[PDB]
Amino acid sequence: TKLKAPAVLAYSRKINPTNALMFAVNWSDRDNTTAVMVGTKTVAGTQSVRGNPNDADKGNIQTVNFANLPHNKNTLLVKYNVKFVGDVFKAELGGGEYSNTLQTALENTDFGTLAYRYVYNIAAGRTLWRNRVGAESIETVITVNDQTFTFSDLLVNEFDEDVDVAEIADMVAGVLSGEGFVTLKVEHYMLLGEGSEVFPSQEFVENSKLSKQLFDLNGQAAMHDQKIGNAIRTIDTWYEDATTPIAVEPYGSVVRNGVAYRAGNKTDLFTLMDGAVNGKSLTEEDQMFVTANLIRGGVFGG
Amino acid sequence: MFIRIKCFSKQPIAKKVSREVSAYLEYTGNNTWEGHISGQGVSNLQTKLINVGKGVKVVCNYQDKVLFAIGNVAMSDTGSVPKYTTKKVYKPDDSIFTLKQGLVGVAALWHDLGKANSYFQRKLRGECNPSDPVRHEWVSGVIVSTFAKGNDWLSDDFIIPEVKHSDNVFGDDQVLNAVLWLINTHHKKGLVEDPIYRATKTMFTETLQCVNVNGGWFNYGDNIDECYKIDTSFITDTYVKQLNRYRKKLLATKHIWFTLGEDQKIAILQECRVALMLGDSNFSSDLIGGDGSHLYANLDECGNLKQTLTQHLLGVTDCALKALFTINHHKPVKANFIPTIAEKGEGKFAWQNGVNMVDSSIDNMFCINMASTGKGKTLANLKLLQHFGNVRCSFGLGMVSLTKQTAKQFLDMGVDYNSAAMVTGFSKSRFNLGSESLDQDEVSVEYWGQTSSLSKVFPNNNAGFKNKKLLSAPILVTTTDHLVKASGVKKGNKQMLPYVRCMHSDLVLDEIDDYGIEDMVVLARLVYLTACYGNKVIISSATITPAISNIFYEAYSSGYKVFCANKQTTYKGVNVVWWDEFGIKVEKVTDQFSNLNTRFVNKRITNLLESTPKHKALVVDQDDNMEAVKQSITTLHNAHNSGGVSFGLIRTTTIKDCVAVTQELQNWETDLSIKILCYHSRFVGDTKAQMEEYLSKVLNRKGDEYKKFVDTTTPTAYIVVATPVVEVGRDFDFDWAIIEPSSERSIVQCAGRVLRHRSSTPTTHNIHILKYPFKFYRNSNICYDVAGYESKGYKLKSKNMLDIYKKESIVNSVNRLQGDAAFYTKSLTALEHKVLLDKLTTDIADTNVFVGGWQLTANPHEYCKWRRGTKNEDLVLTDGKWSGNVTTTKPIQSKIWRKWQGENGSITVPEYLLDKTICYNDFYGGYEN
Amino acid sequence: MQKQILTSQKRNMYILSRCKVLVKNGQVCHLHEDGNVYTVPYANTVFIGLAEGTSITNEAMSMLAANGVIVFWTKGGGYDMFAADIICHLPQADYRPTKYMQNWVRLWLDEEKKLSAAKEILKMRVDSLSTHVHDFGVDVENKRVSSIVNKFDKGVTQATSFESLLGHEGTFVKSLYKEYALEYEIEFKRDHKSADNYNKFLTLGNYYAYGIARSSLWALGIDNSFPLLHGSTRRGGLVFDVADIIKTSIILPLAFHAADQGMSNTEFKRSCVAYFDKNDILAYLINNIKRLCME
Amino acid sequence: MQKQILTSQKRNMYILSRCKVLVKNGQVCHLHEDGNVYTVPYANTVFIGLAEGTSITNEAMSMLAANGVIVFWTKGGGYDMFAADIICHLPQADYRPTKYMQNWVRLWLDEEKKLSAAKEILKMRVDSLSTHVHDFGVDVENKRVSSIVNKFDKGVTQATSFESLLGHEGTFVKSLYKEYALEYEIEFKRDHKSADNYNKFLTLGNYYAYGIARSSLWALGIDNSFPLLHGSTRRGGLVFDVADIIKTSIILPLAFHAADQGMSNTEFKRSCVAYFDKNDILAYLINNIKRLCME
Amino acid sequence: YNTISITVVDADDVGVNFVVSKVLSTLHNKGIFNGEVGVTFPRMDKNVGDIITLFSKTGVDRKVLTSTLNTLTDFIHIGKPKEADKVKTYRKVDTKSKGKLIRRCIKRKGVSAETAESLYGNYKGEKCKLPYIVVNSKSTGQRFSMFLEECENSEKFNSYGLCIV
DNA sequence: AGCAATTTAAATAGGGAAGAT
DNA sequence: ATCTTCCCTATTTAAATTGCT
Ligand SMILES: [Mn+2]
Numbered sequence A: 001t002k003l004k005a006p007a008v009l010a011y012s013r014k015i016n017p018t019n020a021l022m023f024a025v026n027w028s029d030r031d032n033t034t035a036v037m038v039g040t041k042t043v044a045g046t047q048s049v050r051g052n053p054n055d056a057d058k059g060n061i062q063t064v065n066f067a068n069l070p071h072n073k074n075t076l077l078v079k080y081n082v083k084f085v086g087d088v089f090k091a092e093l094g095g096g097e098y099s100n101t102l103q104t105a106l107e108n109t110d111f112g113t114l115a116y117r118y119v120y121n122i123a124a125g126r127t128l129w130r131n132r133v134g135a136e137s138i139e140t141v142i143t144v145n146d147q148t149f150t151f152s153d154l155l156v157n158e159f160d161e162d163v164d165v166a167e168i169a170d171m172v173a174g175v176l177s178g179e180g181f182v183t184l185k186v187e188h189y190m191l192l193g194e195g196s197e198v199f200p201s202q203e204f205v206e207n208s209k210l211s212k213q214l215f216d217l218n219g220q221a222a223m224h225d226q227k228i229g230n231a232i233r234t235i236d237t238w239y240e241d242a243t244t245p246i247a248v249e250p251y252g253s254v255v256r257n258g259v260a261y262r263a264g265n266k267t268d269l270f271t272l273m274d275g276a277v278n279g280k281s282l283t284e285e286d287q288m289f290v291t292a293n294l295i296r297g298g299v300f301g302g
Numbered sequence B: 001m002f003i004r005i006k007c008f009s010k011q012p013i014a015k016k017v018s019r020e021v022s023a024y025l026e027y028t029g030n031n032t033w034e035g036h037i038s039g040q041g042v043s044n045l046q047t048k049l050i051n052v053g054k055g056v057k058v059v060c061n062y063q064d065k066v067l068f069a070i071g072n073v074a075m076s077d078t079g080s081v082p083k084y085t086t087k088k089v090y091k092p093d094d095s096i097f098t099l100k101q102g103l104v105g106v107a108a109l110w111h112d113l114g115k116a117n118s119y120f121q122r123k124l125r126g127e128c129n130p131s132d133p134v135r136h137e138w139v140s141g142v143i144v145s146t147f148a149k150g151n152d153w154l155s156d157d158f159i160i161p162e163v164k165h166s167d168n169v170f171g172d173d174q175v176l177n178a179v180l181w182l183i184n185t186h187h188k189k190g191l192v193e194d195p196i197y198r199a200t201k202t203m204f205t206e207t208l209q210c211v212n213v214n215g216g217w218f219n220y221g222d223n224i225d226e227c228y229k230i231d232t233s234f235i236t237d238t239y240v241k242q243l244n245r246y247r248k249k250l251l252a253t254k255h256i257w258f259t260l261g262e263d264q265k266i267a268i269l270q271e272c273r274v275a276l277m278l279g280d281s282n283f284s285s286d287l288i289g290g291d292g293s294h295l296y297a298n299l300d301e302c303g304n305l306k307q308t309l310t311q312h313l314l315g316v317t318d319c320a321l322k323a324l325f326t327i328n329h330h331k332p333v334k335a336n337f338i339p340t341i342a343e344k345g346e347g348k349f350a351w352q353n354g355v356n357m358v359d360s361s362i363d364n365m366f367c368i369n370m371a372s373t374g375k376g377k378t379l380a381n382l383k384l385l386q387h388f389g390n391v392r393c394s395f396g397l398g399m400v401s402l403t404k405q406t407a408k409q410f411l412d413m414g415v416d417y418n419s420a421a422m423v424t425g426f427s428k429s430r431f432n433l434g435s436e437s438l439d440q441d442e443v444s445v446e447y448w449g450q451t452s453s454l455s456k457v458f459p460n461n462n463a464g465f466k467n468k469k470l471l472s473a474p475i476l477v478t479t480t481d482h483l484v485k486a487s488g489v490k491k492g493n494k495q496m497l498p499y500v501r502c503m504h505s506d507l508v509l510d511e512i513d514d515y516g517i518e519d520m521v522v523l524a525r526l527v528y529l530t531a532c533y534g535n536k537v538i539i540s541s542a543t544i545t546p547a548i549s550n551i552f553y554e555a556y557s558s559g560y561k562v563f564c565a566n567k568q569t570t571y572k573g574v575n576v577v578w579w580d581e582f583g584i585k586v587e588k589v590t591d592q593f594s595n596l597n598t599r600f601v602n603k604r605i606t607n608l609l610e611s612t613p614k615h616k617a618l619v620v621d622q623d624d625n626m627e628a629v630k631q632s633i634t635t636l637h638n639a640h641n642s643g644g645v646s647f648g649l650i651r652t653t654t655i656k657d658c659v660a661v662t663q664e665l666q667n668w669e670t671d672l673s674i675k676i677l678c679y680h681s682r683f684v685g686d687t688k689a690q691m692e693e694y695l696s697k698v699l700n701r702k703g704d705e706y707k708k709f710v711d712t713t714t715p716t717a718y719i720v721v722a723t724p725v726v727e728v729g730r731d732f733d734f735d736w737a738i739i740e741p742s743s744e745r746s747i748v749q750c751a752g753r754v755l756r757h758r759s760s761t762p763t764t765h766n767i768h769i770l771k772y773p774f775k776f777y778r779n780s781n782i783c784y785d786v787a788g789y790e791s792k793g794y795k796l797k798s799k800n801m802l803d804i805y806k807k808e809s810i811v812n813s814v815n816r817l818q819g820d821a822a823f824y825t826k827s828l829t830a831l832e833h834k835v836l837l838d839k840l841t842t843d844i845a846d847t848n849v850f851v852g853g854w855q856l857t858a859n860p861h862e863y864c865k866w867r868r869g870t871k872n873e874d875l876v877l878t879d880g881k882w883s884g885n886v887t888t889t890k891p892i893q894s895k896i897w898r899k900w901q902g903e904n905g906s907i908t909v910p911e912y913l914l915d916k917t918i919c920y921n922d923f924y925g926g927y928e929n
Numbered sequence C, D: 001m002q003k004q005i006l007t008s009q010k011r012n013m014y015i016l017s018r019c020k021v022l023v024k025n026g027q028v029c030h031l032h033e034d035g036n037v038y039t040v041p042y043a044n045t046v047f048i049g050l051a052e053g054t055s056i057t058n059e060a061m062s063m064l065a066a067n068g069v070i071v072f073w074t075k076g077g078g079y080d081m082f083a084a085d086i087i088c089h090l091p092q093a094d095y096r097p098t099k100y101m102q103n104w105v106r107l108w109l110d111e112e113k114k115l116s117a118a119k120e121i122l123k124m125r126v127d128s129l130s131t132h133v134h135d136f137g138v139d140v141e142n143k144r145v146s147s148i149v150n151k152f153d154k155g156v157t158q159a160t161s162f163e164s165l166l167g168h169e170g171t172f173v174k175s176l177y178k179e180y181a182l183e184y185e186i187e188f189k190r191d192h193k194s195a196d197n198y199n200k201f202l203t204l205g206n207y208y209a210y211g212i213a214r215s216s217l218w219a220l221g222i223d224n225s226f227p228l229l230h231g232s233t234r235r236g237g238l239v240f241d242v243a244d245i246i247k248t249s250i251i252l253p254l255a256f257h258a259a260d261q262g263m264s265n266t267e268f269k270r271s272c273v274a275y276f277d278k279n280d281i282l283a284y285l286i287n288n289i290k291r292l293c294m295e
Numbered sequence E: 001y002n003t004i005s006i007t008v009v010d011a012d013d014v015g016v017n018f019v020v021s022k023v024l025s026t027l028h029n030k031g032i033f034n035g036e037v038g039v040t041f042p043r044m045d046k047n048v049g050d051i052i053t054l055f056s057k058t059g060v061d062r063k064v065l066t067s068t069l070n071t072l073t074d075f076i077h078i079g080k081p082k083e084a085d086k087v088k089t090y091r092k093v094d095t096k097s098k099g100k101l102i103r104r105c106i107k108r109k110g111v112s113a114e115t116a117e118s119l120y121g122n123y124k125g126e127k128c129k130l131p132y133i134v135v136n137s138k139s140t141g142q143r144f145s146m147f148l149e150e151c152e153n154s155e156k157f158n159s160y161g162l163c164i165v
Numbered sequence F: 001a002g003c004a005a006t007t008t009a010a011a012t013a014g015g016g017a018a019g020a021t
Numbered sequence G: 001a002t003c004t005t006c007c008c009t010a011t012t013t014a015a016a017t018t019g020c021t
């Protein structure tokens, strides 16, 4: 007993998405993909900072980025490849006095549901935060091992039953429970309207710097890989007072709301893995949450 | 349990208490109930009989003793239920009550004459500095002294004369000097910086003539001429007749004032000052509204002009007169007759039947309870208090947790919260986890109780929760600092609440040896003040030194002389009750206390010595104490272990010493399985509390429940390196201890932490005393001053413990009980006794215990500071993030057995160690790195 | 009500007769036709039985049930021969502790565990005899009582069914009834309908032990529909199974002494309060039924 | 006054208020407030209730219990009962627990029927939501509420353990709380300690739900110590489990309407008992417990 | 005047106010606010709130506006039409910053650029701290911030739900 | 000093009416 | 009906004073 957790214990990320490159298409002209360019407009304004009152007279020529659709294409296309990898129970930096006990404590994990919610967050449009808002038509095409799947009307908040997501979830759960990998090429086509302004992900700027950096690969608007990884693991409906699916965190913590849902109420990942290697009976939902964290990965040492 | 409740009440307060008392007992008719109920039923009946309102007139009888008496019902002195009680019972030569009335009335009509200067008027209106150059009490004293020098101050018309700046206002007339000291010290006492005056002044006026304006009143002094130009708008109808009637009252009674003794005058003027602040704060708290303008005294919360000075003086007078009347004519509310006390003690509590050798009708009692630990000392103290009748006492104890332990004993034996009041004035966040419903512990702060009649004379109806628990408690289980302020304070009215508390209640001070020397001086001052009003002092200390027991008896004897000559009764002596676990002895002692006390001490020593030796201590020869600790740990594990598992206590002196011993033992390569704990006091709220509860549940050896809190399967050395926080108030039982020597009472107390719960005698040696303290390598001139009575005035000639202690010795209380003044420079015990008789002496000095003449001054509260510590700033941990220069560090992780983490709380760092980083750590708290 | 006297620590018990029970000024009080209003300590009452000619309002039941007082009526099936339905209202507004129901029904459903529990409660009869001795009647240590207790234990040890149990009851009770009667020099036939004091005091003590047993049951949450003894003449449920632990130890010696020492109904009632609170019989039955369920 | 409550199929839970129940000319009657006597037919009633202002007498109690009319004492309204005895198979002929009670016990014991009955109690809670459609409340057929209903249905059907059912039950209950908060324009978070109108109105409505569920559990003889969802140490957990069926369907919309219009507590009590009388909510709970226990 | 509620729900992944602003934009672009439907917000303390409240005098039904906000249905909630005798009506307040009025001084007074800087150099630069929304304007191709504050009720409203004059 | 007569007054008990559930 | 609150209602206790022995 009293199997104390290793200080070096970490797990690798098992859902690896690429950067979500963003293109402009039409709804019936889906093959002509023109890359959405981040424009950048200059704004003239004096600097106002707390530490330098002497520098407020002149300076701060700032040039803020923006990204709209072109005025001939009404559909935004978002392309990214989500790579699910198996052996989520292998610790990369941990070892096997604790990670092997985790293997033999989370073998009864229903990966079917875990994978369903992953592919449902892929398909329903959780990966399209501010640009699925106000779109009159949502479409998702998933290409997986030469199989094409079409999704039109999936409400993203609840994980309802559709056999299309389920079909992919099968091979995704077979990867995640076993050994190997699977790759889902996900292209989202959302009809926002003619010249509607799109929403790339944001680089962190300083309190000063410029107003807003949109995410650029080679000049073209895109969204962060870790931001999509936040979308995919947004499956946590099993904490106490669970209203909406949150991103599976080791503490159940969302930064933008200023509260942590699983911290400080004995449902955090660390107490559940210590309970697993000390062998108390877990329910299915918290064990699924622990396996979702191990799929997410991260260093758990102290 | 069969009780009978009778009602004396008028009103429908004979009706709405009848619903509750008829909910729990059967009605026998004629407003009398009688029946069987449980003790918790008695508690529920008390709680819903007192809370129902004011005017409840309820007497309860369990068998034939009175259970409780709601209100000031006279009820039973001999028989119960009187007939009509009307008026005019005794009407004596009260004399000293008329003296206190005259002094308080004359001073209270003159206490705020000095607010009439123009500086106080613009201070209240707010166009100058709110701090006066000279305080208004001194200006009123200057007014009264100038009027006394000019006209005959006792029988004349008043008229305020032209006053100037006077450095001293105290003359020779003893009664005038009393009125002047009451006027000047109605806010704060004068403080005398003068060393020759502090050296020599003893008498009442002869010390009072040294109280000048420079002792706190003369703040800065640039607007003195405006501070002494005064208007005379007080000459009205009711003020002049009130002044005339009180002055003539004093005139008629001051003939008995010169027949008093010094001790009387000091205690009577202390009572007068307490009643004067009671009346002044009572009238300053409430808002009267009406005013006659042109002159003002106080300000409201909005800063508007209120309480004009004529009616302010009249209100302070009547409130102080009423304060005096209720504090001098109170039959105070006492506790319930606890039925789980009065039966026989069985087995190891069988000495508690010594109360059947004490007289139940003695007006005074000085108990010296020299019984050893584990015998139920506090239960015996409650038994001794209940032997004289119903209980009214203040259990003043050191530490919060010891008050919690005595409260839990009081709760589970027989005492509910209608009689008990646990007071810890810090609101600590140490909560009980695991199960709130299945706790059956964690004594809390509610006090259903009963509000006393003294709350109406305090400011703004006493206070909220805390002072209601203070004043109105029958039994007040409190930390001691809520009682030592009775002897007096620097600034404010914080003296009155413990003063009026200790006036009508007994005082029970347990383990007074753990206090400091100045702490024990002010505790014996409190004992003298408690004995000044006929209450009984129970001292409960096993390792008492004759010096301490003597000076506490002399304080009680001076107090009982005050009480005897105050009620015009001839002083027969003090009923001293020597008590231990082997017997009791009650003697009427007016003189020769020393031979009787030493004979009882020798009898207790002979009753301790034929018992088997439980603590055999060997002083090691190894000079270096680090490897002495190593070798002693190895030897006492190889000799004293319970099947391979042994518990050791490394008692060291200070915190960096503790972390040095810990960091050496963690890096110490040995075949022994050392598991190290740090147990000093510098720890965060959470971490510290966690250590406490764990240690209390693993070192409990009365049963084998600990086998499940530690790994006793594998042979392991469970070592706790601790500072003097382990030798005070800890119910710990170690297999053996290694002691760094600081004082001999530390040796006796850490012997009391070894085999505390077991009865098996050691074979070879269970204590290994280190050769030197660790301060020898840092300061060879003085090394025992930290947590010891060595000092700069009392230096040991040699620091070798072969020279100053026995090499093989059975450590018990005998060396502390005996008392030796000779050869104090080369033995630790005689060094201890020397200091104890040279600081707690039968003199008045200035920081002494018989203090007379200086009670009038602020000197015993400035130069004798209770809990005199270092500056002490508090670095606070807020959610894992430290406040000041802390820098969390990482411990050695070699042998730590248990380490609890902390996130909130605070650490107490001396200002000396604030310069550098205290470097807080999860394992050991504060150090120098 | 603060903590409220534990129901084992309530000492007052009443069976009111020919009165109107009501609430005056918040007082549970019974008023007779002579204009006399006697209060009841409702926060200390164990039970209030109601005899013939009695009546009680709603509010009196409301503040008796809030204070945990069991109220029964001595008529209906209260002729005590069939002992079918003594009308006994319990305070179930208070949500009782549950674990004694769980261990009780685990042993109830299991018939072998029910048989063993019945044997334990039958041994509680002789345990009660030994624990609660009386100094005005039969000595428990004489040869007849020791012989019949030994015969009862050796019969209940080798017992196989509840029909065999029903018979052992016949023996113990009937012969203890008789043994007292021969020592009290009275030809006695137990009859609930008989007029002699030896039977009216016995029926009054039957109602008193009914109230004690039902209060001990309800305290733990145990009902009455789960009895341990099943038989043709054992209609009445678990309250009589708990109550006949203390007939021959308490109720029967007090009733026989009362009749022989010419006590009145009121003083027999009081002698019953004195024995039920001096030896603390309610806490005895409550702790012993905790021993019965346990696991 | 005189109040009729249908409970199972044909027997009626009579509620009597401000009346004195006694025996006139050999049969049970009651004098009412208006000074007019009303008799009671023995054939059509089994449960008779005594609300506020009501007194019963001893021979009326005995004759009511001898006719199979088993009496209970309740707070005025008929759904806040504090005193009764336990239903048997017959009141006079024998003393056996009811078939419903025994069935419940057996179902609770074997782990599979306990899990199936926990799933079923939540199935009928979703049924209750649709069945009892309010006017002021949210639409049960609305897309968000139906999505919450189907989420709860999927979660209950796919669960194999009780703590999953507790998480799903809490999600459904507080999701309906969130939906009704979205209706009534407020930040509502369920806490018992808050003094706002919505939380304290929901609290006393929940206490009314506990009372009517306690009456429904008593009326089939179901004891208060066999909870389905809540733990074995929860005192009276079966009352909470049965009241859960109508807490989010009836108590929640009535309480949110009551806090929206802001009327006082007694008229919320009369609205709750009016909804209980009009749609036969107690009869719904009685049939619910029969279908649960019969299986 | 009878009124209807549009409460933004489940907008945590996207700010609540972005959904509020998109609700305003979709209510603008598909008609709704012809001249008589107005908006109000029950929870302006420092944020614009999460409830849009439409108090049209003729009466707004659920069906027309739920067909209008078919794009926001994933994270919207619509209450049934209730009544209110008094609604707390807001209006549009706009900000000017330097060059704005400079171009006005180009086109109204006809003065040169340097003297237009000269008359306005030490002036202007007001800073509105009122709660606001962020609006896509479609006729003028740039996105801006629109500030709302409490004013007396007006009979006529704009195409956005705010008071006129 | 106890008491008696005798006043004076504060309070206790009860009945009726009205308002709650 | 039951019970509570309050207003009469005067009936009912306790104190107060003071010659008288
Ligand atoms: Mn003053």
Ligand SMILES: [Mn+2]
Residues within 6 Å of the ligand: B111, B112, B280, B284, B312, B316
């Ligand atoms: Mn003053």
